[PDB]
Amino acid sequence: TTLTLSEAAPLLKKEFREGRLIPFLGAGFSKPLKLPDGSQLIASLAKTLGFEPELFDMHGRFEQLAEFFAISAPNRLQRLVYEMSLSFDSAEAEALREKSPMHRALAALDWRTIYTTAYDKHVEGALRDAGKQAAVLASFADFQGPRARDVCEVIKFAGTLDQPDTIVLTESSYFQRMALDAPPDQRLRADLLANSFLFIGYSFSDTNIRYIWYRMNQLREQSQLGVKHSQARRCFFATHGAGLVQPDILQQWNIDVIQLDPTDKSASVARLLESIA
Amino acid sequence: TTLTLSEAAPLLKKEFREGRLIPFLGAGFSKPLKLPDGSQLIASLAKTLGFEPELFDMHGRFEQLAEFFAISAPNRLQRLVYEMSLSFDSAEAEALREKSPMHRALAALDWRTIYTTAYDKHVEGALRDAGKQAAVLASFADFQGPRARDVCEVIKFAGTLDQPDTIVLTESSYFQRMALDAPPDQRLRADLLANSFLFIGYSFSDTNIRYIWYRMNQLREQSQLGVKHSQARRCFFATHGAGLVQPDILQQWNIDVIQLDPTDKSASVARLLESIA
Amino acid sequence: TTLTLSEAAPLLKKEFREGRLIPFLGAGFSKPLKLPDGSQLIASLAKTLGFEPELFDMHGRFEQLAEFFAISAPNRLQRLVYEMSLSFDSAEAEALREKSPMHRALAALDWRTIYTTAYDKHVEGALRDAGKQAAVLASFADFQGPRARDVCEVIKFAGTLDQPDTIVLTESSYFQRMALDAPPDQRLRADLLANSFLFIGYSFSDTNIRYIWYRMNQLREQSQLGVKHSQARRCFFATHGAGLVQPDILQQWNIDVIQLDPTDKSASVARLLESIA
Amino acid sequence: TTLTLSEAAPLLKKEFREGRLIPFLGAGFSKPLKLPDGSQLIASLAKTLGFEPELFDMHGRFEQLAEFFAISAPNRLQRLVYEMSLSFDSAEAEALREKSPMHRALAALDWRTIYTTAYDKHVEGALRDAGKQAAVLASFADFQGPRARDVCEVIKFAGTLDQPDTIVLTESSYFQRMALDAPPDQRLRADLLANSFLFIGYSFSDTNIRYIWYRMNQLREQSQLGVKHSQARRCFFATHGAGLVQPDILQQWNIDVIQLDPTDKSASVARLLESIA
Amino acid sequence: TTLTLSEAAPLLKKEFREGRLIPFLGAGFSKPLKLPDGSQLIASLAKTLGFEPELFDMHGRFEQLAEFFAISAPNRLQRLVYEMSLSFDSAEAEALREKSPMHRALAALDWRTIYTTAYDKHVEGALRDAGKQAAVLASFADFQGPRARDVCEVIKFAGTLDQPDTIVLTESSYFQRMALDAPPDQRLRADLLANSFLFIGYSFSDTNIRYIWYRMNQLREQSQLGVKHSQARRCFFATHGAGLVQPDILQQWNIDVIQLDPTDKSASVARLLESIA
Amino acid sequence: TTLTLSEAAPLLKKEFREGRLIPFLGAGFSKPLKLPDGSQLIASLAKTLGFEPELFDMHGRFEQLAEFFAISAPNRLQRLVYEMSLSFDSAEAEALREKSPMHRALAALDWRTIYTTAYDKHVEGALRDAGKQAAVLASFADFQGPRARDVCEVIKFAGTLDQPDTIVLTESSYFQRMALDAPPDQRLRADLLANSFLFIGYSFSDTNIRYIWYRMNQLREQSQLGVKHSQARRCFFATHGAGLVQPDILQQWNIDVIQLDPTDKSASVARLLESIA
Ligand SMILES: NC(=O)c1ccc[n+]([C@@H]2O[C@H](COP(=O)([O-])OP(=O)(O)OC[C@H]3O[C@@H](n4cnc5c(N)ncnc54)[C@H](O)[C@@H]3O)[C@@H](O)[C@H]2O)c1
Ligand SMILES: NC(=O)c1ccc[n+]([C@@H]2O[C@H](COP(=O)([O-])OP(=O)(O)OC[C@H]3O[C@@H](n4cnc5c(N)ncnc54)[C@H](O)[C@@H]3O)[C@@H](O)[C@H]2O)c1
Ligand SMILES: NC(=O)c1ccc[n+]([C@@H]2O[C@H](COP(=O)([O-])OP(=O)(O)OC[C@H]3O[C@@H](n4cnc5c(N)ncnc54)[C@H](O)[C@@H]3O)[C@@H](O)[C@H]2O)c1
Numbered sequence A, B, C, D, E, F: 001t002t003l004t005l006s007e008a009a010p011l012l013k014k015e016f017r018e019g020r021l022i023p024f025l026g027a028g029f030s031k032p033l034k035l036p037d038g039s040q041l042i043a044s045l046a047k048t049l050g051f052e053p054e055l056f057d058m059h060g061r062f063e064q065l066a067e068f069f070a071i072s073a074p075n076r077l078q079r080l081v082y083e084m085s086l087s088f089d090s091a092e093a094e095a096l097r098e099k100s101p102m103h104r105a106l107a108a109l110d111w112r113t114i115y116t117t118a119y120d121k122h123v124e125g126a127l128r129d130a131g132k133q134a135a136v137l138a139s140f141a142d143f144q145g146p147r148a149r150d151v152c153e154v155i156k157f158a159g160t161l162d163q164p165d166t167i168v169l170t171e172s173s174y175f176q177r178m179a180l181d182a183p184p185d186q187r188l189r190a191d192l193l194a195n196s197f198l199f200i201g202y203s204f205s206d207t208n209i210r211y212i213w214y215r216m217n218q219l220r221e222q223s224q225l226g227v228k229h230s231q232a233r234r235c236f237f238a239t240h241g242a243g244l245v246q247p248d249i250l251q252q253w254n255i256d257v258i259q260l261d262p263t264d265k266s267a268s269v270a271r272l273l274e275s276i277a
């Protein structure tokens, strides 16, 4: 009911040599860089607001606790972006990034489009370390702006720290993205029409991602394909700790789960990216 | 930062005598009828699937565990509706409903529209007990069908057990309601343009409700009213156990919190409905 | 294939005594007040821009010629609203309005909601002449504002001249209303769920009206009613000069055509409104 | 106020050598193939229905007369598609297509994406004549299906005759495309984020095209770019017979008009496509 | 044991002047129009699928190889119908149809019902060439629709290319016709109760035809007629190349074989149709 | 795309220990008994009729050549049954049946129902050799007659040689079985509702078998199960020489193909039946 690493490796080679595989990277892809995930940000937001980190986490979801932080005082969200910039894109986080085996194995492949939901320059920065060049596309002016003819376009689906208006962190920013009208939303839905995705380091907890794959399956069911042909194009979801309910919800949406070895989380991902090559 | 019962009582009399107050009832309004809430359904779904109820609750949200139940076997969702009808609308639940002080105090007021998110006939059934007559509107055929000129219209926002196609319980049904195209969705958004709502027994955990009050705030901010006039029309949120984060999120959306006495949850609501009269 | 006046008269009495009939008034309802229709505005916009009125009408539709007028010079649209106010709501147009037999026959009936697409105060002003009182609702602040317990609400679907931001006349304003997010758009779609409409003086040329009745039939077809029950609730379209193609397009959308006598257009409408009483 | 052929020629070379120019072809691109345009179809639909062709055109727009044709009898639309196949993609229309100077000059350039609103195989068929290979993408199964690594993708925006469910010809089919949910609609809106378009043989009469460029300007105005940077990325609209109103409406939407010589309409387009090379 | 042309000619005159003779035309009736039979379609289906035409034929019957073609890819059957319409009903196939001596001799007789198992308009199109008018009946809507008082009804037993839902080509479509519930199946079984049939250009290889004549003989045997009276009403089977087994199987079913001259297959059929006149 | 012996072995153990696996045996199961298949009968029918065996086969299918044999002379079919008895159920065919490894491995399993389409007592006779007892059910009197409480019922789907009226060999006998009214037809369709079948030694060439699995899938599709649940119950088709078209036709009908080793056809089947134990 769940693919292993050796079973999913020839399925990822076929989609990559056709140029129809696109990585979708999450917050967990920057964990060997000693960066906070969605839980240690809330531990840092509770320290500023005067909460205890265990008591503050019981007052709502991740989207709702950041909305409470941004309206506690004026210019409180701007300060967070400044602090995050100092800690996510620091010089010691760049030094851990050349010697990271995942970021070397990601940049060794010749991708054309990479989607990320992280606030750091460590995905396109891994491409600059391997001699390649990337193109960060986060806002409307980036898509309209000039780029080289053949460059891996890194689509910042959540925003970038150098453009603080594009960051979706609070609940009102996620509700603004429910209309699927943003330029990262329009680019994702057109690439999902024709390409397989590889989810690495991302867990389907945001309802803005789960709603896009819902309405792609709707176009699939109304097109009245057979049992054989509607199950042909799959997506892949590499996760060390997938439960029992969530892999069966995603079988509806043509998303296969790749079970990685949870003992060393960094080396299990690196062996997946080297098996595509 | 939170209204009490005596403070919010003259604010509810003014909106009621103008005919601009509409109750929004949740699952907690049927708790003195000894009915399961959203937690004891999951304890019953885990018993059928072979899970332990504490282990099954850690694999996702309420929307996602019901989606996992409905796809475990064919005709598994239909059986649940049949079982729910035997336990929610039973004869012993009707007998506890005439002697319930909340259902007597609700039907004593001359309402015109009541919104509910519960799967039981105990809100309109309380109106039949007081000699009044109600009109259940859940599907498109109910809105098109005939009704008395002046009858309290009970809008089943989540569906009714006698029309099992209207029930939104699984995650795919909540994503179908995100487009705000259903007849309960279109009727709610037009009544929110001109009326105050009174939330009783409902906790803002569903993202389909929180997204409607978000977009209402959009129409409000783009209309460029002042500080005084954009804060004039309020909504009221009676809750025994509101935390510290959630009342401040709802101040953005013109929703005031009424703190009820948590010692006796049944009598605190009944004193609120008698203070409107 | 088309109802006459005597055939449609008992069908309009039944929906009116149930309180489920709502008039939809167009620009043609103000033609006995000697006001310009959509053709004499274009003859006045061409005189300002330096065009001949016959040459200016061949360069695009009514929506597109007003968009060209509004961007010819700064503050050009505001001047038009000021001029329209001087000519539509003048004192000699009010004097022709008490002695108009259509406006007397409209105000003699006890309506609850009237939708209008004409930029003038001659529909609610006819209600003030008969001793009744009305409530103009055009913007978001009007729906939020205070009204009396029971007062016929006149919904300005196109806007009002005393609130020039609500006027939809140019093409960019009609494209802004395609999202169906405006408060007149949300109120219309919820009243269409449960009520019959009577189109008087309006011709279905705007694609914002034809798109609403399209998506109400979609909810009707997906609900899988029978042949008998999906054709039960009709709408009525009184028109002196309906062609051969347009009455058959509207049979899809449960809209019946009432053929009025084209010799005297003012008296044919007045006999329809007196036959409802 | 309007570019000529020699002025717009270096502006089209710059966008083509960067790979950011995409042709948008209309019904007028197949006029040297002696095929009917939108006016001679209506002359053929009126002959079947028993109308005179001059009387039938005065009963509504092109979208509305085809809706009237499709509901006159059962299986009346299927017959039209079959008849159109016999006349549009006939053998004598293919023989006029190798010796056509526009189709030779179109296939001489190394495009990557071509959008067409025509139901015929003479745009991708021109690419097969020049030794190149194309990929017709019209339905959801085409985007999901296999293609080669690098092949010019011809996006049938209106549908193809070999898949009669994808054809948008009647008014109900254009209203179904207003939601912008179709796979040609989602692919167009993502390519418009980053590319210049070249409109050849198409006149902006369909409100489904004019609404897409409206909402791309919304993203542009809300992003708060300057006067210089919001006017940087243009689109080009080659037309022999543009009027006086329509070129100024499209300056709002960053669409420049290229005036071609109306004496020989076939040779004026061919000199434009050879000036890009 | 087999009738010749001169022997069967007075037997066909007697059934024709009584109005009790009905032609049953097959795929071989369109062979002078240079159209593919059931063998050259399989040679064209093997070219698309990548098979060699000699290796593809050894993998199953004609019904089974078309079922394999239709499920190889989505929208693969709708592509075939479009391609067939370009080649069967082309303009050069119509030009060979006026000068064909069989189609002239068929239309010279005053028939009332013609059954055909070919997908093309060259049987009713031969009737339009002789000044007569025909009525194609293929689907349920054709039988319900209006026709003139007296017009030869051409029953498309296999379907027509302008209604692609009626085409029976794949194996699942032949199994759907085994229930004998289709409107061409119900019309054939009632005409077989009272009329002689003339099989021209058809070989009894489909098990849906052989099963109808089986169950008409079952009615004959249970009615307990004598040896003389059960053999009175015959059917006629004109074939150039009937073997040794198949003419004796059909003597059970009151089907006589007319041996035509196999040197010129076109002129042998034309002398049969002129001998009926 | 095709299961091997080791892959299909745990899938057959699960259905057997639940008691939901039923063998379907063909003519090829008696080939190590040196019995004629469907090709050497035709070589024996051609010798009686005076044909050459290579010329006789080109005159029709297996069903049609036996129909020609039975009507060549009176009492010609009765003689064939008598001759077949002398050769199929002879004493030297029984002596090869105890030492046959397939018949030992078939009788070692504790079956409850076995379907056969062969004319010999070597399937139930293998059960008598292993000490077990069987019950031959071929006609209506066998189903009505007495059997023991628990005895493997051998359903002769084609008939038995000791009841010559039940033998379906000629074409008129197969057309009599198309109505699915025979007691072997009614018993098969009810066991197919709830059980997996294992096809051994049978090739899907008879259209009476392929039509039953067609109409079981029709019930499956009208019941509107999902993609996961409609593919749950499979059937298994062990064949040494399956082609390229026929395994893909049967994927529609939930029939999986087990590829056996074609070098030794007797030992490959015996290793399959021993892998179930
Ligand atoms: N600048 C950043 O990197 C950053 C940091 C915190 C939050 N955020 C934003 O807030 C959102 C919430 O973050 P989240 O982490 O809670 O959810 P998430 O879905 O983005 O990350 C969780 C996933 O990371 C994976 N993961 C954890 N450790 C890993 C490892 N060592 N190697 C590979 N994968 C590993 C988990 O298995 C899990 O599937 C994020 O999606 C992001 O938009 C960004
Ligand atoms: N037929 C039913 O009544 C029923 C039962 C379970 C679930 N559901 C559906 O599933 C959803 C989840 O149910 P949920 O209960 O978890 O969410 P909920 O928001 O509807 O109910 C929680 C609210 O009930 C209030 N409440 C609890 N006890 C109360 C009392 N004695 N008096 C007054 N209020 C009380 C809580 O304070 C809390 O605010 C529901 O919204 C519903 O759509 C319906
Ligand atoms: N302040 C105004 O009254 C005014 C004036 C011009 C335009 N407009 C706006 O521009 C839009 C276009 O105006 P339009 O008139 O071209 O379209 P319209 O559809 O609103 O009016 C046309 C309809 O008026 C009817 N009509 C004409 N004369 C009539 C009469 N004597 N009695 C009853 N009905 C009569 C026609 O039969 C026709 O059905 C309008 O809908 C409006 O929004 C408003």
Ligand SMILES: NC(=O)c1ccc[n+]([C@@H]2O[C@H](COP(=O)([O-])OP(=O)(O)OC[C@H]3O[C@@H](n4cnc5c(N)ncnc54)[C@H](O)[C@@H]3O)[C@@H](O)[C@H]2O)c1
Pocket: D026, D027, D028, D029, D030, D031, D032, D035, D036, D037, D038, D039, D041, D062, D088, D117, D118, D119, D120, D158, D200, D201, D202, D203, D204, D205, D239, D240, D241, D265, D266, D269
């Ligand atoms: N199979 C087809 O080609 C076909 C034919 C008719 C209609 N249609 C469909 O119906 C729609 C309406 O068709 P339409 O023609 O009225 O609108 P259109 O906008 O598609 O075509 C009109 C444009 O063609 C241009 N044009 C005319 N002659 C030309 C020439 N010789 N060279 C270059 N350009 C020329 C006109 O200047 C004008 O700008 C079409 O968009 C299409 O979807 C398709």
Ligand SMILES: NC(=O)c1ccc[n+]([C@@H]2O[C@H](COP(=O)([O-])OP(=O)(O)OC[C@H]3O[C@@H](n4cnc5c(N)ncnc54)[C@H](O)[C@@H]3O)[C@@H](O)[C@H]2O)c1
Pocket: E026, E027, E028, E029, E030, E031, E032, E035, E036, E037, E038, E039, E041, E062, E088, E117, E118, E119, E120, E158, E200, E201, E202, E203, E204, E205, E239, E240, E241, E265, E266, E269
């Ligand atoms: N549009 C078409 O005409 C067409 C083409 C191919 C297949 N099909 C369909 O597929 C089925 C299989 O086609 P098939 O041809 O193999 O079977 P068939 O039974 O329809 O045709 C065989 C018959 O054609 C006759 N025939 C051959 N040449 C002839 C000639 N020159 N004059 C008169 N008769 C001639 C043969 O004697 C033979 O009896 C067809 O029945 C049809 O339903 C239709």
Ligand SMILES: NC(=O)c1ccc[n+]([C@@H]2O[C@H](COP(=O)([O-])OP(=O)(O)OC[C@H]3O[C@@H](n4cnc5c(N)ncnc54)[C@H](O)[C@@H]3O)[C@@H](O)[C@H]2O)c1
Pocket: F026, F027, F028, F029, F030, F031, F032, F035, F036, F037, F038, F039, F041, F062, F088, F117, F118, F119, F120, F158, F200, F201, F202, F203, F204, F205, F239, F240, F241, F265, F266, F269
């Ligand atoms: N008394 C008999 O056994 C007998 C003999 C001849 C014909 N018949 C009847 O006429 C029909 C036609 O017979 P048919 O054989 O041509 O069709 P069939 O489908 O019954 O047999 C073909 C199958 O036999 C299998 N087979 C061949 N050799 C085998 C072996 N050594 N081990 C296992 N399987 C083997 C083939 O793989 C093939 O799948 C039969 O179905 C039957 O009803 C019965």
